[PDB]
Amino acid sequence: ASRLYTLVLVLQPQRVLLGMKKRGFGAGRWNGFGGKVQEGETIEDGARRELQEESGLTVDALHKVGQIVFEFVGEPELMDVHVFCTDSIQGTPVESDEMRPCWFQLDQIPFKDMWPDDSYWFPLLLQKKKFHGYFKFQGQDTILDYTLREVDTV
Numbered sequence: 001a002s003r004l005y006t007l008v009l010v011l012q013p014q015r016v017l018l019g020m021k022k023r024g025f026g027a028g029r030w031n032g033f034g035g036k037v038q039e040g041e042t043i044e045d046g047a048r049r050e051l052q053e054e055s056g057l058t059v060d061a062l063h064k065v066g067q068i069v070f071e072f073v074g075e076p077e078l079m080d081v082h083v084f085c086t087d088s089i090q091g092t093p094v095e096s097d098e099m100r101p102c103w104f105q106l107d108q109i110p111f112k113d114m115w116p117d118d119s120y121w122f123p124l125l126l127q128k129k130k131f132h133g134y135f136k137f138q139g140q141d142t143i144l145d146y147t148l149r150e151v152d153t154v
Contacts, residue, residue: 001076001077001078002069002077002078002079002080003036003077003078003079003080004036004037004043004046004080004082005034005035005036005037005079005080005081005082006034006035006037006043006046006047006050006081006082006083006084007031007032007033007034007047007068007081007082007083007084008032008033008034008047008050008051008062008083008084008085008086009032009065009083009084009085009086009125010032010033010051010057010059010085010086010087010089011085011086011087011125011126012087013087014105014106015103015104015105015106016103016104016106016109017055017089017093017101017102017103017104018030018031018032018101018102018104018109018110018114019031019032019033019054019055019098019099019100019101019102020099020100020101020102021098021099022097022098022099022100023097023098024098026115026140028113029113029114029115030102030104030110030113030114031114031115031118032083033050033051033054033055033099034046034047034050034051034054034081035050035054037082043082044062044084047062047082047084048062053096053098054096054098054099054101055093055094055096055099055101056091056092056093056094056096057089057090057091057092057093058089058090058091059086059088059089059090060086060088060090061086061088062084062085062086063084063085063086064082064083064084064130064154065083065084065085065125065128065130065131065154066082066083066121066124066125066130066131066132066133066154067080067081067082067083067131067132067133067154068081068083068117068121068132068133068134068135069081069133069134069135070117070134070135070136070137071134071135071136071137072137072138072139073136073137073138073139073144082154083125085125106126109122115140116141116142116143117133117135117143117146120133120135120146120148121133121148124148124150129150130150130151130152130153130154131148131149131150131151131154132148132149132151132154133146133147133148134146134147134148
């Protein structure tokens with residue numbers, strides 16, 4: 001079985017917003033905003049909730065840009081991450097207990113301090129291409145297997 005997660009990338013024409021994860025899973029890496037989808041909310045509502053909780057931001061619209069499935073060796077549950085993009089933020093980003101937000105120019109994206117899979121699929125996001133991904137991890141550092149392709153419908 002898989003568990004539903006969200007990931008939101010605030011992508012403007014010359015910069016992208018990332019958050020430094022301060023605690024919990026993936027702490028110490030820059031990432032998009034998101035988390036587990038809860039009972040009683042749609043996937044998109046979950047993505048909005050997490051963006052709000054983690055950055056203080058609300059948005060007009062969220063666009064579906066990809067799905068990535070993660071397997072971690074030894075872990076029963078797969079992560080089914082629904083990836084969204086926006087360029088219509090409302091408010092100014094503010095630090096939360098979970099995330100410290102910062103803007104990065106698109107040629108200074110800090111891949112060495114991000115999840116290793118981002119190096120593979122960010123280019124597709126940046127090129128406004130819809131994708132499906134699968135990544136098999138050994139721990140949090142080592143990609144054993146992956147697949148990646150462009151799709152018409154996410």
